[PDB]
Structures are given as structure tokens and as C-alpha cells.
């Protein structure tokens with residue numbers, strides 16, 4: 489269990505207002521940024537450059553912000 | 563398993579912030595595509611007074627299965 493906080497560079501936008509992200513990880517998570525910049529003479533492909541997400545196991549509950557979103561993975 | 567596109571209701575906001583300090587570009591918002599191996603819940607949380615306690619408001623993510631993908635988007639892989 490052990491709720492972990494996502495670094496402030498990765499936040500959720502809900503419609504807008506942007507919220508910190510808390511993870512209740514039951515399964516590992518991956519994050520890839522996709523862009524259509526693999527360009528041929530007629531087509532274009534997607535390149536998946538993975539994003540490194542710094543996660544911090546929440547030390548004490550009093551570190552939690554006043555409002556945030558919680559992503560729970562079974 | 564399969565791929566689901568989350569509507570612009572929910573999107574991921576990435577802030578580079580830097581190798582010069584930008585600090586004025588702010589966040590860049592990308593549509594989310596999910597590669598669910600196991601299901602995902604998303605609850606908004608707000609602090610309610612106890613003294614320690616948070617008011618969890620659920621959020622219905624209306625993900626749509628593709629068979630139409632934008633040029634820029636992130637892929638959440640579980």
C-alpha cells in the first residue's frame with residue numbers, strides 16, 4: 489500500500505484546474521509520451537519516449553495537500 | 563489488453579519548467595490514453611475537519627475505445 493505522491497511536474501487537469509496526483513499502487517504503472525514525428529515521405533509514425541515519474545512514499549499524512557486526486561490501481 | 567481514450571474532461575498536465583528556467587510556459591496538457599491491465603479508480607479528495615480526514619468525491623472517466631488519435635498524447639500503461 490503506502491500511498492505515494494507524484495512529483496509536481498506531473499499533475500491532473502480536470503474540467504481548467506490542475507491537481508496533484510496521489511497513487512495507491514497495486515500494480516506498476518508506466519507513462520510514455522507519444523508524438524507523430526517519425527515522418528516518412530508520405531506517412532508519419534508515433535515515437536513513444538517514456539517519461540520518468542519521481543514517486544515519493546508519503547512519510548506522514550500531514551504532507552497531503554488540501555485538495556488532490558487519488559488514482560487507485562487494483 | 564486494449565486502448566481507451568479519455569475525453570478532454572480528464573487530461574495529463576506536464577510542466578517541464580526547464581536548460582533554462584521557463585516558469586512562464588506553465589503546464590502543457592495532453593489527452594490520456596489508457597492501456598489498462600487492471601482497472602483504475604479516480605477520486606477527487608478534499609480536506610474535511612477532524613482535529614486526518616479527506617472527503618473523496620468520485621469522478622467518472624468516460625474513456626472511449628478506439629478502433630482518430632491526436633498528434634500529441636500520453637499513454638498510461640498499467
Ligand SMILES: CCCCCCCCC
Nearest residue numbers: 498541559572604623638
Ligand atoms: C502518473 C499517474 C498518471 C495518472 C493516470 C491518469 C488516469 C486518468 C483516468
